[PDB]
Structure formats: structure tokens, C-alpha cells
Amino acid sequence: KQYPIINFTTAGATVQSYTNFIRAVRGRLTTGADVRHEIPVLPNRVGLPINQRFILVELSNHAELSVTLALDVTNAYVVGYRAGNSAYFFHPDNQEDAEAITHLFTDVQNRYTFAFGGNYDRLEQLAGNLRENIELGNGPLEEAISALYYYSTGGTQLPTLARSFIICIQMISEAARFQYIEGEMRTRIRYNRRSAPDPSVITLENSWGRLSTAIQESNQGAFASPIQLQRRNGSKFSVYDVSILIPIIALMVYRCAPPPSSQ
């Protein structure tokens, strides 16, 4: 009947509970059968049956409000979400997606498709500010959980909601993609701090696809071309290799077929 569901709450959130969540998500996003340079590859979009296409991440807070997010298992990205009797979807880029998302939350009373997409550029201009000016951590997650919930009742406005998306995507999608960003959130969560992300986190987000390509295109682990990146102090450094990334990126989109038996 329903796609797989992962449960998480911000109530009593520890570093432990957060990490065992993000791990459980990763468990559902990939089998782990496709692993290249030690890194799990996301299932290939082409030929993928609609019934394996999405996963469900349910989020609740101390107020006991809950929302369920839909993640595409091919890009590990949020395509929409449900709160109570209403379901909301980001504007599809093509016919094929538009079809796919009709297999989600089919029992919901009301179904809305946004006139806008869920890409960062779009969300930033709606919420009124950049990812860098938007804070993260257990507290900003609790508020976003609520704002998404009360949107269906008219309680939430657009910029506030947009910002709420930016937060959850990063804390969940981005967190699942990168063990590094998972660590950045662990930090925040552990001490109950809240802070906007640094240039390193942001650039990693912008670079996910390209890294995925280079890695699967690599020659015995060596890139054909480097990818620019920033550390926390916003200074650039170039990545010519794989072994650097293994501690960083947890999942990869599917660029091409796996490698030969050798390595």
C-alpha cells in the first residue's frame, strides 16, 4: 500500500537519535548493493518501478504536530509533503515526474501542486533570504515542522514556509547525502545551538551532483578534473581525488554503470 516510512521527532532529540534516524533513511534510500569507491550509489532512475520510487519521512515535534515528507530515492530529494488531509508538491520539471508524484499520498482529501519548484534558488527568493542567513538545528526544525502543519489551515505564510522547506531539506536530504553535514547538525543538536551553515556546507550542497559524476567517472579513484570547494573559513581548495570524499559524502546519484571486477 504505502512506501517505506522513517520516523523522527525533535522532542528529546539527541545526537544519537538524530544519527540513528539519518542512518535509517539511508537504509531505505539504497540497498547498498551498488557501492563505488566504498560509496553507496542511489538506484538508477531509468527502469525504476514507481512502487520503489519514493520513501516517507515522518516528522513530529514536542507540540506533537506531525508532517510526512516524500523523498525521491533517485536524488534523495524532497518532492512534496503531507499534513493531515492536505498534500503539497513542488512544481515538477517534466511530464515524467508529474506522473510519478501522483502515486504519492493517493488517499489525501486535497492535493495541491505548487507553481514553484523546490530548488534552492527558488526557495531562497521566496523565504526572503539565503541558506547562509537561515539557521539550523533542533529548534529551527521544531518551528518548521509546525509552520508546515499550519499552512494547510492558512496559519502559515509563504516566506515562512519557504524558509521551513530550506531547513528540512538540509537537515534531512542534505544530511543524508553527506556524513559531513550530518556531523554539522550533530554539533548543533548536541549543545542545543542554532546557527546558519558555513561556506563549506553550502558549497558541498551545490557540488553534490558534480562530485557524483567525477567519482563514478574517476580513473582508479582519480578524477579527470578537480572540483572547487570551501572550508569553514570560506577559502577555496580543489579536489582531485576520491579518498578525500569517503569520510564526507554518504550517497551518490547514479551517473553510469558500475566498474569492472578489479577496483
Next chain:
Amino acid sequence: QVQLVESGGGLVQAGGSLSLSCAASGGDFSRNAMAWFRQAPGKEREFVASINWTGSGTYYLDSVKGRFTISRDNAKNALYLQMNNLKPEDTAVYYCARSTVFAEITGLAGYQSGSYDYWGQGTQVTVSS
């Protein structure tokens, strides 16, 4: 600034035909969900037809089902309502309504006047005999 203007209204006889047009401007039309409603005096405002942002998914009030056809030209920034076998019941002021927030609205919400932020001035449809 978003604009909604309906034309094509008038008077016809039971069985007669009409072609309705809404001229929309401003905003991004090609990404906006759209519908037609109607209201007769003394009567509550009733849903008529809805159409998503792409060419096709569409819903009708069953009284009008098969008699009426809603369409849109996203290049022309235009919405259309075709009314063919016309009845005295169909007499009412017809309004076009836009949602700039939503590309598509289905399920219960699709019939609710509340879910659409922009409305047109309206055009009168009277049917005789």
C-alpha cells in the same frame, strides 16, 4: 499585477451555444491552476470546471459534464469555457478564477472558491425558453 477579464457572454435559447474567454495577464500564467465558477442571484456560488497548469487534467460539475469543455492557451495567457447544449439552469453570472500559488488543485479543495486568490469581473449568461 494580475488581471482577469471574461468575454463571450450573452443570451441564447435552450440548446444554444456560447464560447467564453478569460484574458489573464501578469504573474506566471503557465504555472497557475485555473477554474470557472458561476453564481445566480439567490443561489450560492457553485463550482463549474477546473483545469491544471499543463494542458490536461480537468474536472467538471456533473450537471455540465459532457456539455461543457474547459481549456487554456498558456501562450495566449487565456482560459476558455465552451458551453454547448444549454439549459435554463445554466443561467448565471460566470466568473473565472486564478491561483498564482498553485499549478494544480485536485480533491475537495478544487471546488472551493477559497483556494483561488484572483477573480474576474464576471460575464452574464442568460438562456431562454
